[PDB]
Amino acid sequence: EELQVIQPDKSVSVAAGESAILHCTVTSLIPVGPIQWFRGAGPARELIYNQKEGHFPRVTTVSESTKRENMDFSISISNITPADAGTYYCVKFRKGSPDTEFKSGAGTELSVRAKPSTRH
Amino acid sequence: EELQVIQPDKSVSVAAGESAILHCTVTSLIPVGPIQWFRGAGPARELIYNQKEGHFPRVTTVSESTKRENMDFSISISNITPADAGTYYCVKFRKGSPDTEFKSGAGTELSVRAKPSTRHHH
């Protein structure tokens, strides 16, 4: 029954300027600890969202609450540009001193479609 | 990639009169269609919650999401009594003419703890 982190989309394609929804659910509430979203798998990955701390004005959670019982950690990111293309990972932390990474999701690759030129 | 219905808890134990959380998630938004909850697997099973229609005064979603992309269909049922004990199934329907059952979760067995007596005598 060990926790799994489920990212059901391998890939998401959005038009430039549209919002992009990156899905993540968990199969257990055990162990307690934060779910964080990153762009990149690497040491220079960017923290995209953490509900417990920090400011992320582009992100809106699907779950619409911080209830401890929530199992959907999916987010929407507004006004997508090619700078946002990347593989996004939903990561389960175990609370501790310090919190440690328990499970990472498989990644969802965000691609961004350029607006066709006019007219013609 | 085909939709799965995930009920993480084989069993939940609740004290009589308290609320029971019965968890359910889906792994896909495809196909489009309602999630329903039932108590029982058989022909006399009770409809407990229906996304599309009906009044279920004792039942709310755990999730506060009002968004069509929500994947957490866990429910809280209030004011539990032993009459509520049983196995609860989260069921994905495919929208159609009529809607059909696409997949059923594995079920969660709800048990209800009676309140200890306050007396060690007749």
Of the candidates B44, B29, B9, B103, the one whose C-alpha atom is nearest the C-alpha of residue A69 is B9
Give a yes or no: residue B107 inside a domain. yes
- The answer to whether residue B2 neighbours chain A at the CB level (below 8 Å) is no
Amino acid at B29: L
C-alpha distance from B42 to closest chain A C-alpha (Å): 26
Question: Cβ–Cβ of B71/A69 closer than 8 Å?
Answer: no
Residues in B touching A65 (Cβ below 8 Å): 63-65
CB A51 within 8 A of CB A34: yes
The answer to whether position B86 is within a domain reads: yes
| CA atoms of B62 and A67, how far apart (whole Å) | 8
Contact residues on chain A for B63, CB-CB shorter than 8 A = 63-65, 67, 70, 72
CA distances from B32 to A73, B63, B96, B111 (A): 20, 19, 9, 32
Ramachandran region, residue A107 (left: φ > 0; alpha: ψ -120 to 50; beta: rest): left
- What would the 3-class secondary structure string for A22-91 be? ECCEECCCCCCCCEEEEECCCCCCEEEEECCCCCCCCEEECCCCCCCCCCECCEEECCCCHHHCEEEEEE
- Within an 8 Å CB–CB cutoff, is residue A11 touching chain B? no
Indicate the SS3 state at residue B60. strand
Whichever domain contains A81, its CATH number is 2.60.40.10
For residues A27 and A8, the answer to whether their CB atoms sit within 8 Å is no
Residue B71 has its nearest CB partner, among A1, A28, A72, at A72
On whether residue A120 sits in a domain, the answer given is: no
Q: How was this structure determined?
A: X-ray
B62 at A interface, C-beta within 8 A: yes
Q: B33: domain range?
A: 4-114
User: Which among A62, A64, A76 is the top mutation candidate for probing chain B, defined by the most B β-carbons within 10 Å of its own β-carbon?
Assistant: A62
* A95 domain-assigned: yes
Distance in angstroms between the alpha carbons of the first and the last residue of chain B: 60
| Count of structural domains within chain B | 1
**First vs last Cα of chain A: how many Å apart?**
57
Resolution rounded to one decimal, in angstroms:
1.8
Residue A119 maps to a domain: no
> From CA A88, how far away is CA A110, in angstroms rounded?
7
Closest-approach residue (CA) in chain A for B22: A69
Which is it for the CA torsion B80, B83, B88, B90, positive or negative?
Answer: negative
Distance of CA B82 to the CA centre of its chain: 16
B70: number of Cβ within 10 Å? 20
A27 in contact with B, Cβ within 8 Å: yes
**In Å, how far is B119's CA from the nearest CA of chain A?**
36
Domain annotation covers residue B121: no
Measured CA to CA, the distance from residue B98 to residue B47 in angstroms comes to 17
The residues near A43 (Cβ < 8 Å, ≥ 6 apart) are none
Q: Residues 30 to 59 of B: which have CB under 8 A from any A CB? A: none
Q: Which two tokens stand for residue A3?
A: 């926790």
Dist CA B28 CA A23 (whole Å): 9
| Residue A80 within any structural domain of the chain | yes
Alpha-carbon span B89 to B37, nearest angstrom: 6
Three-state secondary structure call for residue A99: coil
Within-domain flag for B120: no
Q: Which residues contact A75 (CB under 8 A, 6 or more apart)?
A: A21, A22, A24, A37, A48, A49, A59, A60, A61, A62
Q: What is the largest CA-CA distance in chain B?
A: 62
Within 8 A of B67 by CB-CB distance, chain A residues are: 62, 64
Nearest Cα to B69, choosing from B36, B30, B95, B103? B30
